[PDB]
Design a protein around this motif. Structure first.
Motif, PDB file in Angstrom:
ATOM      1  N   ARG A  47      10.002  -4.644  -2.121  1.00  0.00           N
ATOM      2  CA  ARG A  47       9.371  -5.459  -1.093  1.00  0.00           C
ATOM      3  C   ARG A  47       8.389  -6.481  -1.664  1.00  0.00           C
ATOM      4  N   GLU A  93       4.383  -4.695  16.792  1.00  0.00           N
ATOM      5  CA  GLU A  93       3.961  -3.575  15.951  1.00  0.00           C
ATOM      6  C   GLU A  93       2.591  -3.059  16.367  1.00  0.00           C
ATOM      7  N   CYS A  94       1.905  -2.459  15.403  1.00  0.00           N
ATOM      8  CA  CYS A  94       0.575  -1.939  15.592  1.00  0.00           C
ATOM      9  C   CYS A  94      -0.323  -2.736  14.670  1.00  0.00           C
ATOM     10  N   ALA A 132      -1.809  -1.653  11.836  1.00  0.00           N
ATOM     11  CA  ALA A 132      -1.430  -1.413  10.445  1.00  0.00           C
ATOM     12  C   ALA A 132      -0.248  -0.444  10.347  1.00  0.00           C
ATOM     13  N   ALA A 133       0.669  -0.559  11.296  1.00  0.00           N
ATOM     14  CA  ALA A 133       1.817   0.316  11.333  1.00  0.00           C
ATOM     15  C   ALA A 133       2.907  -0.311  12.172  1.00  0.00           C
ATOM     16  N   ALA A 135       3.375   3.489   5.197  1.00  0.00           N
ATOM     17  CA  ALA A 135       3.559   4.259   3.973  1.00  0.00           C
ATOM     18  C   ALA A 135       2.637   5.460   3.802  1.00  0.00           C
ATOM     19  N   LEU A 136       1.451   5.397   4.391  1.00  0.00           N
ATOM     20  CA  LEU A 136       0.466   6.464   4.229  1.00  0.00           C
ATOM     21  C   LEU A 136       0.418   7.578   5.265  1.00  0.00           C
ATOM     22  N   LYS A 155       4.582  -8.753   3.752  1.00  0.00           N
ATOM     23  CA  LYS A 155       3.250  -8.182   3.750  1.00  0.00           C
ATOM     24  C   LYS A 155       2.363  -9.124   2.922  1.00  0.00           C
ATOM     25  N   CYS A 160       4.474   4.162  12.346  1.00  0.00           N
ATOM     26  CA  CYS A 160       4.578   4.489  10.927  1.00  0.00           C
ATOM     27  C   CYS A 160       4.055   3.476   9.914  1.00  0.00           C
ATOM     28  N   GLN A 220      -4.674  -9.175  11.789  1.00  0.00           N
ATOM     29  CA  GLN A 220      -4.880  -7.733  11.751  1.00  0.00           C
ATOM     30  C   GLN A 220      -6.367  -7.359  11.797  1.00  0.00           C
ATOM     31  N   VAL A 230       4.947  -7.018  10.260  1.00  0.00           N
ATOM     32  CA  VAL A 230       5.232  -6.685   8.875  1.00  0.00           C
ATOM     33  C   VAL A 230       6.390  -5.694   8.800  1.00  0.00           C
ATOM     34  N   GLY A 249       7.550  -3.019   7.370  1.00  0.00           N
ATOM     35  CA  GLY A 249       7.051  -1.975   6.507  1.00  0.00           C
ATOM     36  C   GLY A 249       8.053  -1.172   5.720  1.00  0.00           C
ATOM     37  N   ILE A 250       7.549  -0.560   4.660  1.00  0.00           N
ATOM     38  CA  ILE A 250       8.319   0.305   3.795  1.00  0.00           C
ATOM     39  C   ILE A 250       8.745   1.557   4.578  1.00  0.00           C
ATOM     40  N   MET A 251       7.860   2.092   5.420  1.00  0.00           N
ATOM     41  CA  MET A 251       8.186   3.296   6.190  1.00  0.00           C
ATOM     42  C   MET A 251       9.153   2.963   7.320  1.00  0.00           C
ATOM     43  N   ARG A 252       9.027   1.760   7.868  1.00  0.00           N
ATOM     44  CA  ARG A 252       9.907   1.299   8.935  1.00  0.00           C
ATOM     45  C   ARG A 252      11.320   1.193   8.358  1.00  0.00           C
ATOM     46  N   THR A 302       0.870  -1.155   0.000  1.00  0.00           N
ATOM     47  CA  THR A 302       0.000   0.000   0.000  1.00  0.00           C
ATOM     48  C   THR A 302       0.918   1.220   0.000  1.00  0.00           C
TER      49      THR A 302
HETATM   50  C1  DCS Z   1       0.303  -5.258  10.174  1.00  0.00           C
HETATM   51  C2  DCS Z   1       1.041  -4.141   9.488  1.00  0.00           C
HETATM   52  N1  DCS Z   1       2.254  -3.692  10.007  1.00  0.00           N
HETATM   53  C3  DCS Z   1       3.013  -2.685   9.462  1.00  0.00           C
HETATM   54  C4  DCS Z   1       2.553  -2.061   8.322  1.00  0.00           C
HETATM   55  C5  DCS Z   1       3.386  -0.938   7.682  1.00  0.00           C
HETATM   56  O1  DCS Z   1       4.088  -1.068   6.450  1.00  0.00           O
HETATM   57  P1  DCS Z   1       4.344   0.135   5.425  1.00  0.00           P
HETATM   58  O2  DCS Z   1       5.236   1.079   6.078  1.00  0.00           O
HETATM   59  O3  DCS Z   1       5.001  -0.554   4.224  1.00  0.00           O
HETATM   60  O4  DCS Z   1       3.030   0.654   5.006  1.00  0.00           O
HETATM   61  C6  DCS Z   1       1.298  -2.437   7.688  1.00  0.00           C
HETATM   62  C7  DCS Z   1       0.855  -1.733   6.469  1.00  0.00           C
HETATM   63  N2  DCS Z   1      -0.270  -1.071   6.367  1.00  0.00           N
HETATM   64  C8  DCS Z   1      -0.678  -0.296   5.104  1.00  0.00           C
HETATM   65  C9  DCS Z   1      -0.637   1.078   5.341  1.00  0.00           C
HETATM   66  O5  DCS Z   1      -1.922   1.396   5.676  1.00  0.00           O
HETATM   67  N3  DCS Z   1      -2.742   0.220   5.642  1.00  0.00           N
HETATM   68  C10 DCS Z   1      -1.987  -0.788   5.295  1.00  0.00           C
HETATM   69  O6  DCS Z   1      -2.616  -1.925   5.215  1.00  0.00           O
HETATM   70  C11 DCS Z   1       0.553  -3.486   8.288  1.00  0.00           C
HETATM   71  O7  DCS Z   1      -0.618  -3.945   7.816  1.00  0.00           O
END
Ligand code: DCS
Ligand code: DCS
Lengths: 269, 269
Positions: free
Chosen positions: A45, A173-174, A176-177, A237-238, A140, A235, A147, A197, A199-202, A28
């Protein structure tokens, strides 16, 4: 509307393994001024996810082109890419399956994100703990029921995001972050080799922090440990980065890490 | 062809959460002489899965009718039912999602199963360990990437099924079947409150064993423990039961449990 395997489609074959077993991966990305932010990282990724999932694709160039076109059309918003093993195989078997399916779509940029930024994030500890599995950790992939369950519980509270632990009790993590917390000059983020996950932002933030004067450490930390931090940041990507006002009722006073990452996280590739 | 929400369809909306996150559940039943074997158990388990997944459905009567019709048409084979949360919700959120999607299909009865029965099953220990998560344990939900990964590794060996351990080392099940092993008069089967799928055939066999002179026990057992059994048996709705010749190179001599369950497992509801 969606772009599937090169053309506009609103439906997908029922036999597709994404549908049957969530057998695939996705990403995403943030679309700004007609450009996919951190495009190469998103492609990279998806490639690592397909690799770890044994999904062989030779469509990377076409997928990138497709992502840029949709992004130019959308101009501002969210771009989602899904790649699955496709159809085929007997039962769970990948033998004779394929070719891979690629699904692209864009939607306008969410509304709640901006307000969440101008008010701070509140985290609630999640009762749903992530199972640990190094074979799927970091990727991902499409098995996101955990989730969905984490999110449902999160809505039963007044928090904006969840603090998710794994089955051993480690902060991961969170919903979705990804999460970072700071203690003085040390910035911490959970190791994602067992769950969560990557993440790209991580990854972007880790590259920033690494080169910065901040000492970045990937750890295996308990809830209590993480909750004794001066500041907490999350964090994706969005967002791309959000300051955490408090987790549960443990308040965080600083936002210097956040102030340091925020500006840098909205000017990348 | 598939029957989706009451009508013939070969495709499904891309937005469906089964496709996006494997957000749903399913069951796979044996169709014999135009009848769904163990029909009420299959319905009952789909209901428990939807319940645990917070997927609210009021279509159970229609779903049953639909299952019986497809079964009468197919006459002999396999009947698969998939239920997902449907489309909707922002991100992983279930809020504003729905209505649930129901997908039914039947295929002819596999060929390899019969030969596998007249030659014995060979199990290979799986390198992929199931993550533990009581919130998803037991449910035949759509997040089966672990099973796809287990299966891929299994094909790298000469075994017919895998012996799957969880992240703590506990024997849990097979790739697509449940497992029982016997030691004298004690029959053992792994507890599935942390991982694995609580199968329809496993529940059927547990009901048989419970009422039988065999002492049935649900345990948390290590690989070594399970590998010191006189006999090993695996099951799923389609087999329905198979004798295990050996796990790895640990051979099993008896097949009395198997001979006891086999006949009884092909005459149920
Ligand atoms: C469980 C989980 N952890 C971490 C991340 C963060 O990864 P990015 O930095 O690559 O986004 C996501 C992404 N969530 C995207 C961002 O918003 N909704 C999503 O499903 C996620 O679903
Ligand atoms: C991981 C796993 N464990 C156990 C079972 C057994 O449950 P039943 O007794 O209800 O079938 C299945 C079902 N597998 C069906 C049966 O064959 N293929 C499947 O996907 C399964 O996928």
């Amino acid at each position: 509307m969606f772009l599937i395997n090169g053309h506009k489609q609103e439906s997908l074959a029922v036999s597709d393994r994404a549908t049957q077993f969530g057998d695939g991966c996705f990403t995403t990305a943030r679309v700004i001024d007609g450009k996919v932010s951190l495009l190469s990282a998103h492609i990279q990724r998806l490639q690592d996810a397909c690799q770890r999932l044994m999904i062989s694709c030779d469509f990377w160039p076409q997928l990138e082109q497709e992502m840029k076109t949709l992004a130019a059309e959308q101009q501002n918003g969210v771009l989602k890419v899904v790649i699955s093993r496709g159809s085929g195989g007997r039962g769970y078997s990948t033998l004779n399956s394929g070719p891979a399916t690629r699904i692209l779509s864009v939607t306008a940029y969410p509304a709640h994100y901006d307000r969440l930024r101008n008010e701070g994030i509140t985290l609630a500890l999640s009762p749903v703990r992530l199972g640990r599995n190094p074979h799927l950790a970091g990727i991902k992939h499409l098995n996101r029921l955990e989730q969905v369950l984490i999110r449902s519980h999160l809505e039963q509270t007044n928090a904006d995001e969840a603090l998710v632990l794994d089955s051993e009790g480690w902060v991961t993590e969170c919903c979705a972050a990804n999460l970072f917390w700071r203690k003085g000059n040390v910035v911490y983020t959970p190791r994602l080799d067992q769950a969560g996950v990557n993440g790209i932002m991580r990854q972007f933030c880790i590259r920033l922090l690494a080169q910065s004067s901040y000492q970045l450490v990937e750890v295996q930390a308990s809830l209590e440990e993480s909750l004794q931090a001066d500041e907490m940041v999350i964090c994706n990507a969005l967002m791309p980065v959000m300051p955490v006002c408090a987790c549960g009722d443990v308040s965080f006073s600083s936002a210097t890490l956040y102030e340091y990452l925020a500006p840098l996280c909205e000017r990348p590739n």
